[PDB]
Design an enzyme around this catalytic site. Structure first.
Site: not given
Ligand code: 35D
Ligand code: ZN
Ligand code: ZN
Ligand code: 35D
Ligand code: 35D
Ligand code: ZN
Ligand code: ZN
Ligand code: ZN
Ligand code: ZN
Lengths: 305, 305, 305
Positions: C212, C264, C67, C101-102, C63
């Site tokens: 975003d 992901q 970004h 925005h950030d 961020h």
């Molecule tokens: C604020 C909010 O609701 N968020 C949830 C999603 C999160 C997020 N943002 C991203 C932005 C750009 C690209 C990818 C993004 N991925 C996000 O979260 C997903 C990636 N994740 C996970 C989920 C469970 C996991 C368990 C073990 C290891 C890695 C994991 N990654 C979920 C940001 C905060």
């Molecule tokens: Zn933000």
């Molecule tokens: Zn952002």
């Protein structure tokens, strides 16, 4: 007036400048006075000049402020062991050229800039970064209280600029292969002559290569540690290349990390060894670089298992 | 006026100062007023003093600005739980000493500087860095609008300087072993007496050690995370040692990464546990440091498999 | 006046802004003039405004300043392919909102700040960081020679502020799920209407989410590389959570590194794909984001072995 250990071991080719930036400038001034002389430059104008250069180096893993001082020391080592070969103009001129040789370097090769279609690539068709390095240099000299060649005649001043120009450009490795090959022949035939200015520039050219690569002439533990900084730069460039939809050469491909011991082996054989070889042929006092170089070559082979 | 969670948990020995630098200063001012009092120092002159100190800390993985505040909090925790033992001079004096105890630290031990033949090693034969830490301190106080002891008498002022001097030097771990051993005896015989200034300095000395090491008295997740920053400093020093043609002790050898769980085990047994042990003997309110310390000791044994 | 390769490929949704900060500002000005017009803003007042914003971004793995520019380009791409849908006020207003925005982001989510009991969490009960991002924005505009909407009427000025306010808040992902779901229905029934300001804000809201998150709409090599920066932020937050005696969700747990390919996968399915899906339904020209998104989705499945 440097610490005893430094005063002593600064004359060594494989000397390392330690992790004391604040002490880096001092180490440089000392070398100017031992190689060239105290009244070569006004102290204050020099110190002002140095700080400005330090400021125009970037925090890039390898091609940074430390690289700049390290390269310069090797030159000093070369100058001190061939003390009767050069004028003060060349001496004072070459030490300065070494410190500025990678000014405003960003950690990307000329290849990437042309791929990226960077403003400088359009500005400088060939030897893009090196031409910029010299451009930066002139800008700093043109600063007030920064012209350390103020005391020089306009004739001498122009001369030292050419020296510096020619020298800096020579740090383009692409130019090296043609230069070494020419020098290799002229040395053989005996046609090689230091009183010939065309011949003379080429030696200086090869001297600059020796310094820019001198991390291979350090002791093994330093050489191995310095290696990390360099691939940091390469792999990053590979990443940006990949961001262009372009598969980079394995050298800049971080996926091919294992291959690095052989990648270094090939480089020594093809580039480093022929370089310091030729140099010692012309300047026998520069052999320690070569010996230390091969000691590191033996280590790389020892790595492969 | 600190957040509720902070106001509450700042009184805890194992308190962590979070990742909010901008909030770090505030956390300090608060502690001065709770331990010493509001009119101990003029606000503006203090804030000016703080920012200057923050500025003279370096971005070194461990011995940095965060370390400085963390160490100070432990002292505050010690001061608040032994509130009737010390004067304001000592209180206001000790909190300040803790924040400055590693000023201008570069991340290298006194051993390396002597090996490197550094200017400071020639300047300070023993306790090289710590003597510098106090030197830095005086320079900052001598700055205009920075003398927070301006309101103090020249007698009081000199006294608080000695306190700070003695305290800072005590953060040399080499001195600790002799200090603890002496205190261990005097406590046993009953000869130990807080009204004796010679005796009194030694306790203060041991108090400073407890704080400088307090990362072992944090909760396990913090203790484990802080550990990374410390070896970052060690291994780097090992690297520079290797650059001197010197095989460093396994602690600074990054090749011996696996060994770290036992390296920490040995340290707890030989240094940390005896330290907080002795301290609680003299100052029973300081036991939570000891308990938390052993909880971490149990974790290290739990690591070895 | 941008390099040829840039002028050409800047119109591409999956365009990357390269590793040339100094060139980043220029890339932005160019986009304002192509989308909005040259006389939308006074050059100097704009450049002054930009440098100030760049200065109020922090060096946080993800961020950060990069970004900010990246997000803005996606918006530009959206604006250029839906050129007849928006006024200049909205255009000039939305590009600005994206860059800010950030602002002053520290790399921690709103969840952590509330846990930490941070001053801002007390100040902003909901959408803590985003409210701060807009607060920062106003402060910068209120700077002298920084009001780029100086030429606007106080009516227009207030309007563009609301646009920017609404837009920035929308970058709260927690708000997204309710917004998409509402838009999904209204599109179906046909009740969805761009001339309705309540409806209009929601689209803009969804447009902001698309930007975003646009790192999922880049080519695979960029998407994969950008991924490292993001988890750097997550795992760090997990660390601080652990420092609070709080077991963080597996996403912020660096121990669960292997799990990332599935983490992901789940995100794409549940968040990213439904997002760009809905957007193309409303704005068909925005499909390349969706296609590129799924291409990356296929890659994640290809990762699991
Ligand atoms: C604020 C909010 O609701 N968020 C949830 C999603 C999160 C997020 N943002 C991203 C932005 C750009 C690209 C990818 C993004 N991925 C996000 O979260 C997903 C990636 N994740 C996970 C989920 C469970 C996991 C368990 C073990 C290891 C890695 C994991 N990654 C979920 C940001 C905060
Ligand atoms: Zn933000
Ligand atoms: Zn952002
Ligand atoms: C401008 C130019 O011609 N270059 C080629 C040589 C390169 C280079 N410079 C060095 C400077 C100091 C010390 C070592 C240096 N090594 C260089 O490249 C060699 C190291 N290499 C490789 C080659 C192939 C590889 C394949 C897989 C993994 C690593 C590899 N490394 C080649 C610099 C750019
Ligand atoms: C000045 C002095 O006497 N020192 C010795 C102790 C050292 C030290 N300081 C610490 C401060 C906070 C928390 C932990 C600390 N640990 C220290 O050293 C112990 C950790 N160690 C070792 C020892 C041997 C090892 C062998 C292989 C791999 C790691 C090892 N770690 C020893 C600092 C320098
Ligand atoms: Zn170069
Ligand atoms: Zn170079
Ligand atoms: Zn210390
Ligand atoms: Zn310390």
């Amino acid at each position: 007036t440097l610490p005893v250990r430094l005063c002593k071991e600064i004359e060594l080719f494989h000397f390392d400048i330690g992790p004391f930036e604040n002490m880096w400038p001092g180490i440089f001034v000392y070398m100017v006075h031992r190689s060239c002389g105290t009244s070569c430059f006004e102290l204050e104008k020099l110190c002002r000049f140095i700080m400005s250069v330090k400021k125009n180096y970037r925090r890039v893993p390898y091609h940074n402020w430390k690289h700049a001082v390290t390269v310069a020391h090797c030159m000093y080592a070369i100058l001190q062991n061939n003390h009767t070969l050069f004028t003060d103009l060349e001496r004072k001129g070459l030490l300065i050229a070494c410190l500025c040789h990678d000014l405003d370097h960003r950690g990307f090769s000329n290849s990437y800039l042309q791929k990226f279609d960077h403003p400088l690539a359009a500005l400088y068709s060939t030897s893009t970064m090196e031409q910029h390095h010299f451009s930066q240099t002139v800008s700093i000299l043109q600063l007030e209280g920064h012209n350390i060649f103020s005391t020089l005649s306009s004739s001498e001043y122009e001369q030292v600029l050419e020296i510096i120009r020619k020298a800096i450009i020579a740090t383009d490795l692409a130019l090296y292969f043609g230069n070494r090959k020419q020098l290799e022949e002229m040395y053989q035939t005996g046609s090689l002559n230091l009183n010939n200015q065309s011949h003379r520039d080429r030696v200086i050219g090869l001297m600059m290569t020796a310094c820019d690569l001198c991390s291979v002439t350090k002791l093994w533990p330093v050489t191995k540690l310095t290696a990390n900084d360099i691939y940091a730069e390469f792999w990053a460039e590979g990443d940006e290349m990949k961001k262009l939809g372009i598969q980079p050469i394995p050298m800049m491909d971080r996926d091919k990390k294992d291959e690095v011991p052989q990648g270094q082996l090939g480089f020594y054989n093809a580039v480093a060894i022929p370089c310091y070889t030729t140099l010692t042929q012309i300047l026998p006092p520069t052999e320690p670089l070569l010996k230390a170089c091969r000691d590191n070559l033996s280590q790389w082979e020892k790595v492969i298992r």
